[PDB]
């Protein structure tokens, strides 16, 4: 089947390439989710910032199906995001200190563990940035991208990741396809 | 005739526009006809979580413990039941009638069964959409009455 960026479950102004793995931002923060979400286990996917011109930003992470598409990821209770500028973490529109910022060429890793103890861990070029969210809301989580203005990112669900985290057990998001 | 998947997702693409949830003379709030619906046409799907029928009894005692009153489970067959108690659509609000204008019926779409309500006759805008619940007949206790207003009303939903 394959795990791709969602065909309809997307903000209509986002530039999504025909392969449905590269997305270009347009104006105000708008979301796109992946075609598959997860409800249990440990899963992983990578996002590569292909191009981040001046005054452009990305908030990347996991979203439940009800998260607002016309808002940034992490705007409501359905998404937790990692912001490119200052490495801020956002859930319910509250930004807290998390890590250093990520820019153009950086490869970001998104880890989620949903046991049958829940955690979200962000990665910068394979290095653990720390637990960002613990004991999260129960539901299906889909890999999600929110972009502010014309920046380009490319999503990689697996099976091969460029920077596999050291000593971390997970399944690639491509296993859902 | 037109293939079921074409008929089926034409429903999903026109259903929200043909029906609405209003206040009912039968009971509480009902599903009402907003545009004339021809006989035999698909009115709405009874959407929800499709579970194995063995789970309904684990499910039903759990809903009591949280206090949810009415049952919202509809049975497809011997193996499956649509649980619309927590996740569903406007088909939850369809009241029962002893002389109804719609009927429930199971259709198969790509190896998965759905419960779709069809128009028994021609239904005009303004009407209340009702079907025969067809509950198993219960005891004198746990026997709740019917107020559909039909001139041949059985007087009980059970």
């Amino acid at each position: 089947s394959r795990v791709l960026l969602a065909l309809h479950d997307r903000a209509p102004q986002l530039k999504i390439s025909d392969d449905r793995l590269t997305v270009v931002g347009e104006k105000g923060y708008s979301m796109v989710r992946a075609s598959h979400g997860v409800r249990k286990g440990a899963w992983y996917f990578e996002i590569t910032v292909d191009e981040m011109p001046p005054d452009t930003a990305a908030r990347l992470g996991w979203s439940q199906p009800l998260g607002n598409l016309q808002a940034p990821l992490g705007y409501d209770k359905f998404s937790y995001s990692w912001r490119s500028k200052k490495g801020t973490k956002f859930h319910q529109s509250i930004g807290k200190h998390y890590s250093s910022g990520y820019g153009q060429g950086d490869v970001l890793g998104f880890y989620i563990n949903l046991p049958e103890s829940s955690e979200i861990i962000f990665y910068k070029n394979g290095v653990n940035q720390g637990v960002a969210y613990k004991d999260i809301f129960e539901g299906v989580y889909f890999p999600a991208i929110s972009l502010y203005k014309s920046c380009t990112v490319s999503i990689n669900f697996g099976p091969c990741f460029k920077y596999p985290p050291k000593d971390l057990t997970y399944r690639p998001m491509s296993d859902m396809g | 005739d037109l293939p079921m998947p074409m008929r089926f997702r034409h429903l999903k693409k026109t259903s929200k526009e043909a029906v609405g949830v209003y206040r009912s003379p039968i009971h509480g709030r009902g599903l009402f006809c907003k545009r004339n619906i021809d006989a035999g046409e698909m009115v709405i799907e009874y959407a929800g979580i499709v579970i194995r029928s063995i789970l309904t009894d684990k499910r039903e005692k759990y809903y009591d413990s949280k206090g949810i009153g009415s049952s919202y489970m509809f049975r497809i067959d011997d193996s499956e039941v649509v649980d619309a108690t927590m996740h569903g659509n406007a088909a939850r609000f369809i009241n029962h009638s002893c002389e109804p204008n719609c009927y429930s019926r199971v259709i198969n779409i790509d190896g998965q069964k759905h419960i779709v309500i069809f128009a028994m006759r021609k239904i005009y805008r303004g009407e209340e959409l009702t079907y025969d619940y067809k509950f198993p007949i219960e005891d004198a206790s746990n026997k709740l009455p019917c107020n559909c207003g039909a001139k041949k009303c059985r007087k009980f939903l059970n």
Binding site: - | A47, V50, V82, H114
Partner: peptide, 20 residues
């Protein structure tokens, strides 16, 4: 009082679905 839903969803039972 419920969550709105458009399409049917198949319940994906967990391994311990029938466990105490």
């Amino acid at each position: 009082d419920f969550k709105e839903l458009d399409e049917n969803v198949e319940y994906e039972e967990r391994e311990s679905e029938f466990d105490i």
